[PDB]
């Protein structure tokens, strides 16, 4: 039986992503900043050539709003993809690559705290 996303579920998804977006490291840097929006096609076409399924946090929020994720697992898949793409395009040890590893962890913590699924 297909059915709409319960408002409870949508609110959880938004709280989890807000936690990830709002996260600041110990120096006060908001790690999500560069990841909110993809590079433009014009300025970085090689990104769109190398990366099969580009995604940014703007698109993830839109997919929540449009009820494209049907589960926390769907949401996780897109956040993991975002981070995977970062680690695909960017060099090991770069700030962006390292940040993406932290954000994966922040996501997994936020999901545990906010959904309490265990």
Place of tokens 């981070």: 83
Question: Rounded distance, CA 94 to CA 35, Å?
Answer: 14
Q: Which of 10, 14, 39, 98 binds ligand A1A1P (CB under 6 A)?
A: 39
In the complex, minimum distance from the CB of residue 115 to ligand A1A1P, in angstroms, rounded to a whole number: 24
Which residue number, 36 or 115, has a Cβ lying nearer to ligand A1A1P?
A: 36
Query: Within a 10 A sphere around the Cβ of 102, how many other Cβ atoms?
Result: 15
Q: Is 35 in the site for ligand A1A1P (CB under 6 A)?
A: yes
Stretch that binds ligand A1A1P, among 19-27, 68-76, 79-87, 107-115 (CB under 6 A): 79-87
- C-beta separation of 17 from 64 below 8 A: yes
């Amino acid at each position: 039986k297909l059915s709409p996303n319960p408002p409870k579920l949508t609110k959880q998804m938004n709280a989890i992503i807000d936690t990830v977006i709002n996260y600041k490291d110990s120096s006060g840097r908001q790690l999500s900043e560069v990841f909110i929006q993809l590079p433009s096609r014009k300025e970085l076409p090689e990104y769109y050539e190398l990366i099969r399924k580009p995604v940014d946090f703007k698109k993830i929020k839109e997919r929540i709003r449009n009820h494209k994720y049907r589960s926390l697992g769907d949401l996780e898949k897109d956040v993991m993809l975002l981070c995977h793409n970062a680690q695909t395009f960017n060099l090991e040890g770069s700030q962006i690559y390292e940040d993406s590893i932290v954000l994966q962890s922040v996501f997994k913590s936020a999901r545990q705290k906010i959904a309490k699924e265990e």
